[PDB]
């Protein structure tokens, strides 16, 4: 009766150190719709993250895109942290430029 | 354009 979110973390454009871009966390395949999503920079929560309007796929499962503008550097690490009723602990997915 | 709901479930 409940479905756990899939999570992808990635950039809007191919990443280039020092160039302004958008960091995305796409959560999908989940039910019910309540969900907590945070974008992290070096472990800390980013403020003023935006998100898309709640919608769902043909199988009824929900999806949301959370995003923020960012300028990638070689040192900084980014991640997405997600909590949902189906998760005992928040799941963290790291941004890997090659995925 | 929205569809009006004809009747309650």
């Amino acid at each position: 009766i409940q479905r756990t979110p899939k999570i992808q973390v990635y950039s809007r454009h191919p990443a280039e150190n020092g160039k302004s871009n958008f960091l995305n966390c796409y959560v999908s395949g989940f039910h019910p719709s309540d969900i907590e999503v945070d974008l992290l920079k070096n472990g800390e929560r980013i403020e003023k993250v935006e998100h898309s309007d709640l919608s769902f796929s043909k199988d009824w499962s929900f999806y949301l895109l959370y995003y923020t503008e960012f300028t990638p550097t070689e040192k900084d690490e980014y991640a997405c942290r997600v909590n949902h009723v189906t998760l005992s602990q928040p799941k963290i997915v790291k941004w890997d430029r090659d995925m | 354009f929205l569809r009006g709901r004809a009747y309650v479930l």
Partner: protein
């Protein structure tokens, strides 16, 4: 080509935190064009519609909100549920049309707590009920001639407005953006490497990405991520296979997409 209009509606109860939240989001193909939200404190081509359009749609949204709120109360009863839990009613409805703008088919279906509940059949005249609770709904809707009303919307309003939106939004809605593609290579170990075929910046979302080895589909050995939104109207996807070092040229990535003059065949280029 062919096009669709679809609304995706979600009503969710929240005992102790006010009345259920209702949200309806409308799409043409993979482009969201409108959002109505009962908690609220639209696309460019829709902005030209003006006051008669918005007042009427706002009116319909308010009435639908009332109706979905009473549906949630009824559903709680049909399933012997307590007043303490949160529950969700969803629906998807809309029409598909061909290149000539004629109706290909209509849709109006509902789900409760994530499970199919009742749907209008393709004939636009009968219902398919999932369970004994939905059979009660079916009974009511047959008595009140609901299918006739939904069919009127699907055959009329839906198709006629989809046509208008396509005309007003033709520069974007009728434009397919092809994927920008490349193949990357990452050693996993001394004996294996990952080949990853990328597709970026494409619209609409529908795409086919496959790896072949010696011309045979590697369906089982391919990792294929879900197609994902870039945030700027376009979509992204990749497919990866693990390959024995030195055997990279036996592998080809194939890309099909509406925006492509012709299908791509890609290989790793060291």
């Amino acid at each position: 080509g062919s096009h669709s209009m679809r609304y995706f509606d979600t009503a969710m109860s929240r005992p102790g935190r006010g009345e259920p939240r209702f949200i309806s989001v409308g799409y043409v193909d993979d482009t969201q064009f409108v959002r109505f939200d009962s908690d609220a404190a639209r696309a460019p081509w829709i902005e030209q519609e003006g006051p008669e359009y918005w007042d009427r749609n706002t009116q319909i949204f308010k009435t639908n909100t009332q109706t979905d709120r009473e549906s949630l109360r009824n559903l709680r009863g049909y399933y012997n549920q307590s007043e303490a839990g949160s529950h969700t009613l969803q629906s998807m409805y809309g029409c598909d049309v061909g290149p000539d703008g004629r109706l290909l088919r209509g849709h109006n279906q509902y789900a409760y707590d994530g499970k199919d509940y009742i749907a209008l059949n393709e004939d636009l005249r009968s219902w398919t009920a999932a369970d004994t609770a939905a059979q009660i709904t079916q009974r009511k809707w047959e008595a009140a001639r609901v299918a006739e009303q939904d069919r009127a919307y699907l055959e009329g309003t839906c198709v006629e407005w989809l046509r208008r939106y396509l005309e007003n939004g033709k520069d974007t809605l009728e434009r397919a953006d092809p994927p920008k593609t490349h193949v990357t290579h990452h050693p996993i170990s001394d004996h294996e490497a990952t080949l990853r075929c990328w597709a970026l910046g494409f619209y609409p979302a529908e795409i086919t990405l496959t790896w072949q080895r010696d011309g045979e589909d590697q369906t089982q050995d391919t990792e294929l991520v879900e197609t994902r939104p870039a945030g700027d109207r376009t979509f992204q996807k990749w497919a990866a296979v693990v390959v024995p070092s030195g055997e990279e040229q036996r592998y080809t990535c194939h890309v099909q997409h509406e925006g492509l003059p012709k299908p791509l065949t890609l290989r790793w280029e060291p």
